[PDB]
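dumping this here so i dont lose it again. seq + smiles for potassium ion
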Amino acid sequence: SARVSDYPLANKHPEWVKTATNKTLDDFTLENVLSNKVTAQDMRITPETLRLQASIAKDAGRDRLAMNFERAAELTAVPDDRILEIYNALRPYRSTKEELLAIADDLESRYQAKICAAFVREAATLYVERKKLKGDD
Amino acid sequence: SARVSDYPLANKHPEWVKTATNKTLDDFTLENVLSNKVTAQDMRITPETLRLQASIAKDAGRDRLAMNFERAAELTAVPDDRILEIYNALRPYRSTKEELLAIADDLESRYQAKICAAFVREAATLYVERKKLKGDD
Amino acid sequence: MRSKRFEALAKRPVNQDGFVKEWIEEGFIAMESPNDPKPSIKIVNGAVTELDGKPVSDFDLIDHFIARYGINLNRAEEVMAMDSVKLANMLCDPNVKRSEIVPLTTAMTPAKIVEVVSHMNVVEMMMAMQKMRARRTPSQQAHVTNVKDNPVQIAADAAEGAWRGFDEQETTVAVARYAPFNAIALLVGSQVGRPGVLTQCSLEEATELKLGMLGHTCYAETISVYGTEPVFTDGDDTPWSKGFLASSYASRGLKMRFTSGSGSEVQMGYAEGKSMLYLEARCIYITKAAGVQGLQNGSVSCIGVPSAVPSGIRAVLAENLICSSLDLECASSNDQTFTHSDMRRTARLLMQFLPGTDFISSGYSAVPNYDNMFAGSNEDAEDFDDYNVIQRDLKVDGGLRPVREEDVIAIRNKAARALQAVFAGMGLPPITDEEVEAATYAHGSKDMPERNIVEDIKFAQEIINKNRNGLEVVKALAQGGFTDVAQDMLNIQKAKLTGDYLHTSAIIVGDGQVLSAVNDVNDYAGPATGYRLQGERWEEIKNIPGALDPN
Amino acid sequence: MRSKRFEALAKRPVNQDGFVKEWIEEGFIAMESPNDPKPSIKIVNGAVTELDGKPVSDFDLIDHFIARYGINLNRAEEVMAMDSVKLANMLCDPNVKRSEIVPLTTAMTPAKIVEVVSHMNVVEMMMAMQKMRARRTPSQQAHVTNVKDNPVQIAADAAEGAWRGFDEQETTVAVARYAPFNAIALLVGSQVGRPGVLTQCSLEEATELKLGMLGHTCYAETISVYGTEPVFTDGDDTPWSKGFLASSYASRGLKMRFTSGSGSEVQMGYAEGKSMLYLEARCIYITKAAGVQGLQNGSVSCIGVPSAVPSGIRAVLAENLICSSLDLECASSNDQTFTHSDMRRTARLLMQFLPGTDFISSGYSAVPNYDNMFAGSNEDAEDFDDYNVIQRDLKVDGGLRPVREEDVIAIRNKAARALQAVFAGMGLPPITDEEVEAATYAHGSKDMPERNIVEDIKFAQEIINKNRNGLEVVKALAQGGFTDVAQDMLNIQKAKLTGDYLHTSAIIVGDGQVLSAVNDVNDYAGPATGYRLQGERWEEIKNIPGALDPN
Amino acid sequence: GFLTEVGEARQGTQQDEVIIAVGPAFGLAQTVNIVGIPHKSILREVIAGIEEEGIKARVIRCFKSSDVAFVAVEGNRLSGSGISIGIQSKGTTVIHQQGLPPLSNLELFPQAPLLTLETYRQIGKNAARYAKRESPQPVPTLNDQMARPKYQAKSAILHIKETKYVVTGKNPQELRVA
Amino acid sequence: GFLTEVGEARQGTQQDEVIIAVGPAFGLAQTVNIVGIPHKSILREVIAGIEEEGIKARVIRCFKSSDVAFVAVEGNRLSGSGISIGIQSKGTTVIHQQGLPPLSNLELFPQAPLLTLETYRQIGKNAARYAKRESPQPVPTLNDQMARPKYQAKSAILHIKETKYVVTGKNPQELRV
Ligand SMILES: [K+]
Ligand SMILES: [K+]
Ligand SMILES: [N+]
Ligand SMILES: [N+]
Ligand SMILES: [N+]
Ligand SMILES: [N+]
């Protein structure tokens, strides 16, 4: 658990910051990019980092910000296209309760995104009540 | 003495404002002006009134204002043209120490404007030191 | 090869304004100058021996006057030791009463109080002003003049100004000899717009006092004071001559205030290396010392000097704050042109407008600026609609209101016929029915028939040389079938007899009701307290022209 | 017969503005409406059963979202019982710490907090905003667009904006398909003006997210939320879809905030009879609930609705205050046209300018308004000199600075050549030397050579369809002889990896140094405390063009 | 009364048509756009621009939502070409394409006050051009910084009024342009 | 150097003259008014306007004060007709009358930037007209609301510089053009 004192990570604990492929903040130089020793696949924020920031946000008195960072940590594992699919699925009149619940299961089982999975189940339940499911318009 | 609880005089104690002719603020109607029962000579603020206001200003925590009202009560007795004469006399390089001291004596003995007389003597003394008497330009 | 971006910016009006780099030597610096004296006070046997690092042996007339009359020496040393930051905090703290502040501020030295407000940014200064303003209710003052000293126009424009909300109006002359006419016109029109509106005619000191003696003015404002002895001398007075003049106006039952403003010393050659704020502080104290109830400051007519240097407009608000904090009525300028930019001038005005002062403007031009004989106001007749809109936008009482053309026209007309009757009665160069209708629909002198200046100038001086007083005007009105206006003028006369309106911030509203800092004590204590725009006044401010009912 | 006075006033620009009379049934009232709910909170077993007079059985998605995530239920009931006037007093009291406030406000219900700020006038609101603003240092955001979606111009203007001081810049498109080009141009130009300047491209949600995934934007701001369920629906989202979208942006290392603003519900047909302020309050809480760090509000694009009614602009400042008080970064609008009057728009701007906010303007137009694709900003390129002058006048840091033509020209040129090299490298429709030089000296698109829109539109879509990411841009720059710019682009990408700039109010200054509310905590405690314009920054603000030296 | 509702609109069978979807009050409760141009003249010109390109024009009225984007989407669903044109009584117009997100489009005209009858003809023409799967130059961008200052309040009010004719679940109605 | 100091100016003998009193730096430290008009051209035109009326013109330099009002007064006391014309290097001009309060006058021109050579000729002729004890139509009122915005700062600077040449107690000096 990091705290305000530990922030900014880039300044206080740069070593705490490692990428998906496991590269250092320093490894991202023009050269390593031109020689491809580092590529787009090495430049994604890790769920670890996001969780260190949620800790700092919590220490800064921002629980909701931390919660958001928590969910974000879970989503770093979800493919770009799948993220867009989920988001669209949550928009008004797009899905059926079943499809949302199905999205939830996938999030939890395939991605271990428990937090996000419950968020989606909650939406599903409320979407029924407030009529924002496919066919409700 | 007149208090802030007595202000506005016109509202609280109208009778406190009467001319030396026992005329009241109400006798100042167009009628009495067209019939001349009331003239420009009946329309001057009396030293009594001004002293009532000085009291009120003092009660309002404004001593400088009351002091100004006190000097004003003294000047209600000085002729318009004499007022103008004194004022001019106090302007830069207009008079000599003697003339100012002379004005002072006049104020004190002829108009019994004690306070204003001292004010002028004070000026006279400082005008010497600061060089604002005639010939100092 | 020029950048079209900068060519577009180069054409901007704001770039026509006069800007300069600080010149510490000649006091060409708004405030917080290095040459300004450090606050200090040394009292012996009840008399100041040292004031702001200066020994009494070197006191000039201003030091002397300030030291002897301007400072509450009983708490002077006590407050001097207090922390200026702490004091500045108290000014804007919504929870420190104005009544708790004044005893401390009126005990500070010029340098001390300047040091205090200098620790503040404009948001803090406004927060403080709403609390320090003497009168609880804010008000406005307008200029009513024209390039031809045309009396018919003045009476008309004056009646409109009064109709729009101005509680104090002021006129002046292009050609001095015209004064009596202007003053009478102003007085007559104002009373038609709204009985109670106080009127003044700004002239040379001695001349203006006589005009008041003759009964053609309700009060006087431009009774000047200056920050340095040399400049005060060129002003043709001393702290004593002006103090005397202050008590003379009072002895005639006339309300008055002094006029000062940042930058005048610089404009007149002798700033004595001090900042405009420091010098202006001296003027504020001279005013206090004299026993004068209010002051017209905030640079006023020399607005172009502090505005040309850094933090100039912030300094302008600072001096207004020093004034109110010293328990003095403040007619906060916003009456003189200093910029070609609407954005810039609006920013300058909002400093006083937002928090509100005794007189948000001590000269909003009630006529288009080409007719403004004070060389232009920060606002004029053409801004009226915008002013009512900003009042509506921010829910701020700017002291004015939206009006109907039909009403304005009627009032302007009644004011022209009223004056016509006065001129006929007193046997002065006649006002033709053409001039009357012209003045009824004019926007400025451009719409007025040319008058015989030489003839008016004659009869104008005659009123003075033959001591023709205001009663002649009251009678002419009465015989002219204007019994109403005549009584109104008499009622104004009554006020001078009772002296109520001689008190701090006093103005006359409603049915000849004085409204001053005595009976309308500002009681600001944070949100939901103090003056609040609401009720009928709010409804009045809300109803501007163009507000379509969405149905 | 017409009064010339009113004819002159009738021609006034402000009279071209749209004004309306309150229509309470359709929520066409800025704030303090009678249909607004009274504050209330009822919690059972840690779950709200009643929110502002509304029973949970009736909650819409907004109520549900707010009740469950937006309010600290631990202190909710305690704060509800507190006196709203006392609370409002605490907001503007310079001696009540921001850290003491936040725990209370973040526990209030939408109606509760609205009731509090409504007890305030704009002066008290500003006094509070200077203390409630999350980041200690104020900042600015600019619009960088043009009617032709011309990429060369965008790059140049972006470089200038960055040079003038903007720490966040935003572009958008006239023709959607152009987006990729605008985004890249904006990002390239900005980094040339000042490495660290964050950039965004406002598009339809799903589209904007993908553009951020491809690496062509630094953050996203126009992630909308609404005050009523039916309007949120036509907005094509729910509190959950947006909350999810917020977490998605964060999971890619991108900083983001929501966008709302008074009047949107009215503009979109369903105000549900509530005041613009109450509904906006719900948006502010929707934002807090979602875990989003900041919010762009203060009416924003619907500024024409609240400004048409009484106290509209006062309501705009109030919503900005609700935002900051709720411990959220606030990009305070001042980015949209609502009036033909310079005076009027200036007044609206000063409400945030004077006290300072995280982003004084969330879209000051860095190009002349004819090129502003958000249908006009409350300020634009032609106001640049006036803005620097007001800064100098009031000694207020507006986040910008005076600049030299020679410098602007250079930076604008380097940005055109850089983008040219980017386009050549990625094999996009070429940028000819004519276009480069044109962009170097342009003031707007009128000065730019016509481009093959059909061709650009093609390659623009290709970048999307073939998922061409920002690395292609970094390499093109490197091989194009712009090693420095490529590195800078890289450094900005490294910021996304660390997550530091995802915190409240974060921006990147100096040498890749994040500046947020975490390491730049606002510590306002009255005069001489908190942020103060001074030192070299003040010197920078003072040196505007035209300042002559008297010597 | 130039518009007559003739039963629920059905999906288009041939790709040579473009659907014009208008708000629930278009031609009814409201008969002119934000700046006075009669609805009849507007539709006529849009129709003209479409046919002028060799494409058929089919007009329907949407009720599920008064929002112009959704009105257009309801339309592109029934369009044999997949291209439709949404128009609110106040004038706002959009060129939509079946398959695009609701709040996305091919071309948008965000400032109703600036559209002229020539503009409406241009819109219908480009729509017909998109139906023929061509890549027409976008209709020139119209932008007036003072548009909102002068008409936003009116725009909101007109929309408030049209929205009163919104009916949830009520499918589009094909119209007979008398 | 069109001006030469010829000893302390003496009181006027006949009422057929009008005195032109100019600041201590007029024609010296400063040679043009606030808007570039050469002092020589201004003086020449004022003199012309004077004589064109049949009155003699006598030019003097005041030192006691740089204030235009007092400069004019120092002059009206030596004027055989009692009328004088004060002019500061920056251009500000005033028509004074012996016996009038220092800060009062017959005619004043408070906006130097708006004065043209034709105006200065008008000034000189009305002055000569006042010396003949006539009642001339006052010179048309010139007023520019932007005058101050553009020139007040400059005005103050110029005046600050001319004031450096003020000498207390030093009586006026007769001038030769
Ligand atoms: K005034
Ligand atoms: K923005
Ligand atoms: N005066
Ligand atoms: N001053
Ligand atoms: N967006
Ligand atoms: N909102």
